[PDB]
Structure formats: C-alpha cells, structure tokens
Design a protein around this ligand. Sequence first.
Ligand code: G26
Ligand code: G26
Lengths: 99, 99
Amino acid sequence: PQITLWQRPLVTIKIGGQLKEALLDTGADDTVLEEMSLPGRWKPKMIGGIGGFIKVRQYDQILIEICGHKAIGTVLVGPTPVNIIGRNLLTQIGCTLNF
Amino acid sequence: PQITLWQRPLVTIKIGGQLKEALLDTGADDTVLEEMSLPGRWKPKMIGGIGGFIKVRQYDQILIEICGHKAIGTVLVGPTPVNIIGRNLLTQIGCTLNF
Ligand SMILES: CC1(C)S[C@H]([C@H](NC(=O)Cc2ccccc2)C(=O)NCc2ccccc2)N[C@H]1C(=O)N[C@@H](CO)Cc1ccccc1
Ligand SMILES: CC1(C)S[C@H]([C@H](NC(=O)Cc2ccccc2)C(=O)NCc2ccccc2)N[C@H]1C(=O)N[C@@H](CO)Cc1ccccc1
C-alpha cells in the first residue's frame, strides 16, 4: 500500500506466533522490538538513539510478517519505547519513500 | 522523487542561509537539527526516544528547503546525532511511504 504521514506509520506484524503493531521507520538502520519472548539464541549488542544508548539482544534470521508480507532478518530486542521496523527489513518488503 | 532504503535517505536541506544534509525520518514526529545558528526566539522543550531524553530549543515558523521543496514549520535544535526531518515537514512536501 501507500502510506501518508499525517499519522504515525504503524503496521501489524506477526512474529513468533504473536501479533504486534510496529512503526515503519526510515530513520532506523535496524529493527528493534520491545521486550519479548523469542526462541533461538542471541548475541548482546548496543544501539544509539536520541537520548543515548541501549543494550539489546540480537537474534538473527528471524521470520517476520509485516502487513502480510514476509521477511527474514536480524531483529533486536530491547527497551525501545515502541516496536521499530527499520531499514534492514523495509528493503525486503520493497518499501520506498516518495515525493 | 523515489527513494529506496539500501542507503540512509539523506537529503540536502537549506536553512538559515546554511546548506546541510538531513535524514528523512518517518519514525520521528518532529524535525530536529544539530546545533546551529538560528535567528529568533524559542522555547525549552524536551524530546526523547531510544537513549532517553534530550533538551532542545524550539523555534516556530522556520523556513526550510528540503531537496528543492520549501516548507515552513517547527524545528527543534539540539544534541541529536544527525539532522532529522520528521513527519511534521514530510507531510508538507507530499512525502509518502510505499510498498
Ligand atoms: C538518531 C537516529 C536517526 S541516528 C542513529 C542511527 N542508528 C540506528 O539507526 C540504529 C537504530 C536502530 C533502531 C532504533 C534506533 C536506532 C545511526 O547513527 N545510523 C548511522 C550509522 C551507520 C553506520 C554505523 C553507525 C551509525 N539512531 C537513530 C534513531 O534513534 N532513530 C529514531 C528515529 O527514527 C528511532 C526511534 C523511533 C521511535 C521511537 C524511538 C526511537
Ligand atoms: C523511538 C521513537 C521511534 S518513539 C519517540 C517518538 N518521539 C518523537 O517522534 C520525537 C522525536 C523526534 C525526532 C527525533 C527523536 C524523537 C514518540 O514517542 N512518538 C509518539 C509520541 C508523540 C507525541 C508525544 C509522545 C509520544 N522517538 C522516536 C525516535 O527517536 N526515532 C528515531 C528513529 O527514527 C529518531 C532517530 C533517527 C536517527 C538517529 C537518531 C534518532
């Protein structure tokens, strides 16, 4: 679909048997979800936003459905205020900016 | 134009007589620039997200030019990693997400 930005670009995701809402975010290089239960092994890692810095767990090769489209990729899990779909996966479902 | 997200969506802006680059960012509600010379007066505001929170100055009805397009709106200036153009100006220049 096409999405204008008068509202926040929130979409439904399925990950790990669970339904979530998540933000499509061209400003984020990676994907980060709020604390959840993922099976499947992880490495610790850090990311930075506006007010500094967080420690997240990295899980690789995770399947995610984003608004009905599938993707597989790296997903961080951690104390983000909101779930964020970043550029690693937006490229896999074909997402562009237009103006 | 049509921007793909294999690279960060950086664009050239002109503001306050100065040329800059900025990130187009659908996951930011606001526009925030690194510290820089702006004329006028402003209010204390605070924003946050992933590392926590920051202190920014708020200047209203700033003219900005984003890849050739002019827009007027609120700009925050502050200790951000990179210049962000948020949804408040993306709507102005007719910007959509598409997949
Ligand atoms: C301030 C940023 C725009 S710039 C920095 C970015 N890091 C990342 O994108 C990693 C990342 C991944 C996921 C989340 C955050 C950060 C970077 O520096 N990228 C160049 C870079 C390239 C190579 C090496 C090193 C750095 N963080 C971004 C950020 O917090 N964006 C928020 C707004 O969209 C995100 C947000 C949205 C809603 C609520 C809260 C936060
Ligand atoms: C973590 C966020 C996705 S969630 C929070 C957001 N705040 C804002 O959008 C204000 C704002 C504006 C600009 C920047 C940061 C924050 C919010 O809570 N939005 C609902 C809301 C609305 C009104 C009131 C309360 C809550 N910040 C975002 C964020 O940092 N995104 C980064 C990734 O794109 C941004 C980024 C990109 C690259 C490098 C570094 C950072």
